[PDB]
Curated annotation (Swiss-Prot), chain E:
It comes from the Bacteria. This is DNA-directed RNA polymerase subunit beta'. It comes from Mycolicibacterium smegmatis (strain ATCC 700084 / mc(2)155). The gene is rpoC. Zn(2+) 1 binds at residues 57, 59, 72, 75. DNA-dependent RNA polymerase catalyzes the transcription of DNA into RNA using the four ribonucleoside triphosphates as substrates. The RNAP catalytic core consists of 2 alpha, 1 beta, 1 beta' and 1 omega subunit. When a sigma factor is associated with the core the holoenzyme is formed, which can initiate transcription. Belongs to the RNA polymerase beta' chain family.
UniProtKB/Swiss-Prot annotation, chain F:
DNA-dependent RNA polymerase catalyzes the transcription of DNA into RNA using the four ribonucleoside triphosphates as substrates. This subunit often mutates to generate rifampicin (Rif) resistance. Interaction with RbpA partially restores Rif-inhibited transcription; once the subunit is Rif-resistant however RbpA no longer stimulates transcription. Belongs to the RNA polymerase beta chain family. The RNAP catalytic core consists of 2 alpha, 1 beta, 1 beta' and 1 omega subunit. When a sigma factor is associated with the core the holoenzyme is formed, which can initiate transcription. Interacts with RbpA, which partially restores Rif-inhibited transcription. This is DNA-directed RNA polymerase subunit beta. It comes from Mycolicibacterium smegmatis (strain ATCC 700084 / mc(2)155). Mutations in the RRDR sequence (residues 423-449) confer rifampicin (Rif) resistance. Rif blocks transcription initiation but not elongation. The chain holds residues 75 to 147 of 1169 of the full protein. It comes from the Bacteria. The lineage of its organism: Bacteria, Bacillati, Actinomycetota, Actinomycetes, Mycobacteriales.
From Swiss-Prot, chain G:
Mutations in the RRDR sequence (residues 423-449) confer rifampicin (Rif) resistance. Rif blocks transcription initiation but not elongation. It comes from Mycolicibacterium smegmatis (strain ATCC 700084 / mc(2)155) (Mycobacterium smegmatis). DNA-dependent RNA polymerase catalyzes the transcription of DNA into RNA using the four ribonucleoside triphosphates as substrates. This subunit often mutates to generate rifampicin (Rif) resistance. Interaction with RbpA partially restores Rif-inhibited transcription; once the subunit is Rif-resistant however RbpA no longer stimulates transcription. The lineage of its organism: Bacteria, Bacillati, Actinomycetota, Actinomycetes, Mycobacteriales. Belongs to the RNA polymerase beta chain family. The RNAP catalytic core consists of 2 alpha, 1 beta, 1 beta' and 1 omega subunit. When a sigma factor is associated with the core the holoenzyme is formed, which can initiate transcription. Interacts with RbpA, which partially restores Rif-inhibited transcription. This is DNA-directed RNA polymerase subunit beta.
Swiss-Prot record, chain H:
Keywords: Antibiotic resistance, Transcription, Transcription regulation. Binds to RNA polymerase (RNAP), probably stimulating transcriptions from principal, but not alternative sigma factor promoters. Partially restores transcription in the presence of rifampicin (Rif) in vitro; overexpression leads to an increase in the Rif tolerance in vivo, with smaller colonies. Seems to act by removing Rif from its binding site and preventing its further binding. No longer stimulates transcription in Rif-resistant RNA polymerase (with mutations in rpoB). Monomer. Forms a complex with the RNAP catalytic core, specifically with the beta subunit (RpoB); its binding site may overlap with that of Rif. May bind free principal sigma factors. One of its GO terms (molecular function) is bacterial-type RNA polymerase core enzyme binding. This is RNA polymerase-binding protein RbpA. It comes from Mycolicibacterium smegmatis (strain ATCC 700084 / mc(2)155) (Mycobacterium smegmatis). Signal peptide: none annotated. One of its GO terms (biological process) is positive regulation of DNA-templated transcription. Induction: Constitutively expressed during growth, increases slightly in stationary phase (at protein level). The keyword Plastid does not apply. The gene is rbpA. Belongs to the RNA polymerase-binding protein RbpA family. It comes from the Bacteria.
Amino acid sequence: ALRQARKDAELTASADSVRAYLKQIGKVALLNAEEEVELAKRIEAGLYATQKLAELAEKGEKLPVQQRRDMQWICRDGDRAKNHLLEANLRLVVSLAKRYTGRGMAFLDLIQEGNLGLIRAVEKFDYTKGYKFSTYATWWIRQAITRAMADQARTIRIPVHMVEVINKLGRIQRELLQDLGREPTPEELAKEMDITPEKVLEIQQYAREPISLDQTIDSQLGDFIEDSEAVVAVDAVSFTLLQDQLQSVLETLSEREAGVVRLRFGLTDGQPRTLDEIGQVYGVTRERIRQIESKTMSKLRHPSRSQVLRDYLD
Amino acid sequence: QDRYGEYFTGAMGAESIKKLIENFDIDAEAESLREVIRSGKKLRALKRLKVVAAFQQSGNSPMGMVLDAVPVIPPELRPMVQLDGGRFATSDLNDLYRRVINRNNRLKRLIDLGAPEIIVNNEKRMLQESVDALFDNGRRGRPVTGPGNRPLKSLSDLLKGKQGRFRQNLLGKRVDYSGRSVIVVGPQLKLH
Amino acid sequence: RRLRTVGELIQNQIRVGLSRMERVVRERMTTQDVEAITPQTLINIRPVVAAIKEFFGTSQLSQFMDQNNPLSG
Amino acid sequence: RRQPVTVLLKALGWTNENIVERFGFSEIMMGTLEKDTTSGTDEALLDIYRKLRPGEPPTKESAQTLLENLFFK
Amino acid sequence: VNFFDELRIGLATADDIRNWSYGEVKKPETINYRTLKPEKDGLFCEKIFGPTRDWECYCGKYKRVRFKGIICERCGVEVTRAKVRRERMGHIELAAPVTHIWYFKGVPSRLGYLLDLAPKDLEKIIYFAAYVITSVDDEMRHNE
Amino acid sequence: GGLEEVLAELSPIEDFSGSMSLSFSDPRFDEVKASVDECKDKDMTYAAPLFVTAEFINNNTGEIKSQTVFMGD
Amino acid sequence: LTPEERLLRAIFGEKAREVRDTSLKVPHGESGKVIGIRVFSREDDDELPAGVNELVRVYVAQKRKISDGDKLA
Amino acid sequence: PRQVARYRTDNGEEFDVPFADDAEIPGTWLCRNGLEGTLIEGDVPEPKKVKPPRTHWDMLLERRSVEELEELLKERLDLIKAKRRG
Ligand SMILES: [Zn+2]
């Protein structure tokens, strides 16, 4: 009856996402050193055979049909060898990715990124050195997982080199805790790190991580943030009444004096001009306008015009 | 597949579902349903007709039930802003989107290199659940949880519930020109 | 139906902190050098103290002392 | 869900004669022991061990000490 | 205006979603960790969703209201009001389709009743728990 | 004590090979860091340090040595 | 700055400051006398989290007479 | 003060991108459909000189001389040739 129960166990869908992956990865037998060396030679043979035929595509020279059919079978076998080597060492990736969970990366994402490290491990693996594949693949899988965590897990992405200094800052801070029994102040952290104290706080400022606007503490936090760019009614209405007042003040003046002030600050147009630009319209030198600008300003500072605008300082 | 593989075709995932919808006759399925409903008295075949007939009356293709592209909500509705002294706060959608875009791009990288179906299909279902978690989180399996096991808010969570857009920000609102305070007896007041 | 007291409630968090630590120690003792490591090599108390700090705050049992008058306290 | 009453004694390795002594009085479990899927002591292990976990086909030795691991341990 | 008779709903086809979108978000990036700017081709990217500051391109070539409806050649940001960031949508081009989960998982299953497929079996299909026959050749099989 | 009983649960810590073991014992406390008044003023928690004994034993290889460990305030 | 404002800056000769005003103002509907102040500067060692320099707390008190609407029981 | 430019993506679409009349027309533009496209009329300002990515063949060349693979291929090819001869 165990055979029937065994068939029922193989055939189970399972709701959990990581499970279904554990079933399919445990359905390909592992390897021994001899098989690994065998697959390595098949991969290199299929790759070299593929490049030789590629050299023939540009150079022609169609080879005998029996040799041409066998060359393409080597490429067929080379790719099957690559797929077989990966499917066999797909579990090593899983065994390494277990330890890196709880860091903000989902388990499956850690497993897949580890699989990417396994691909480059197989592509760069050398069978002549006589070392087990797990020896060289362990390095590439860990590097792929860690490199992925630095480039992804952070909502505000941080470059690799900045993530590098933060981890060292943390390890230096945890050891100083064990040594001093108290949290090391930045001076001790900057000393141990060979950097300035004002730099470590800035680096510690980067370590800040965002908070979810939807956190509840019943109404959630998002309702407590007021829109900063939202237009205020009083200031918007005051700006209009301020525009109304400037028109009356500027309306009493020389029509050519009023034009200089309008172009200088931009006003109607919106782009503040310069003395030379205003000189081409009124046909005078930039010096003659500065004289006009100074005379109209002293006439504007004079109290009859400015007595009403005092409230508008801010 | 080894033998007989040239007489048929098969696949898995939403790709195969999209193909089954691509070759489909809502009329032939309906007309066959219309004679099967009464002749084979059937109750389950009748309830199935409402969806088959709904697609037949309108002009929308059933292909709309599978997504080849996912729309992205404007930024200001999923804001990321700072409050006190530089610390940041952002909406949950940004990370739900992040899981979708991240897994989609990793799938492109696996396909170009070429990969065993175990890795590609595993990535495809991950993309399937990431899009699911985005639209409705927790509807299928465990919800995507944030720090401290807090389920992320999903697009569907914005509408539903007493806190959704309807009963919270639509059927009721906070208004200006208003106030409150305690009440004391006004025995000397007129009724008005 | 029994009453879990203050001392016992804190005990359960210390237990979680120690259990969260052994996962690091168990993973550390194997792959960390050899023969000379000793507790100084890897004993990370960060998860232990975090269980305490995370309990006194955010926990429903630990509340701000309610004091309008000495009676409420 | 869906668990018989008498599968546990055969799961624990109890000999069949011991059940009659304890459960013989007041009938009950005796009637429950009268209706069962299988009477095999080791067969009950393979029946119950798979019911809970049914994934990754169960090993013979792993299922025996699993209950001691799940409870006695 | 606030005077319109009816509002109609329906399903958005992949083309409808592409027409809504002002661009494809190609990266899971929010803002630069130093300058705090909306890094390009991510979320919040001004190249698509619109400018952060009113009538301002990202690089700052056009800072004034004189020119609107133009796109900065260097930074690729359109010069217009910052309110467009509320109304402008993006899109993601998937490397493989996906079920909506609103029609599949929602009971009764719309895809289930549509294809005469059982929900238990339909879940096996889309999550890669088992295969399915998309097409058979009934004639060629009959000849051989 | 509540600490002593949880340390008894954690003792010992073994690597599953049985070659080495990690034992805890002897919880130690010293005077508090600051008076409660100074704590409520400086926005710092009111705590006292914790000391314990952790012995690293590996007699399969050369035997290791003990140490004095500080869990935290 | 706008064109309209920044015209007054020229007539009144008040240079627009690079800094923006963010102050601490007592909220709507309360008053009293300031009892004391507590200030933590960064120049003085003190203790402060990353990014903060000077921390100041003001304690305001008021003598509340019994008023119409206050709750008695 | 705005002159319009058109582009065509690799799939055959076309998009209108408004620019400043005083500005410089770019050769290629990132279009809202997700792809990039070449200019409408003005043709090929720059090749961009994109370098090809490294391939499994490049990684294998570092660890093997051509003769080594050649010798191994003859060893592998004559192996299957032995089955042909049986
Ligand atoms: Zn620009």
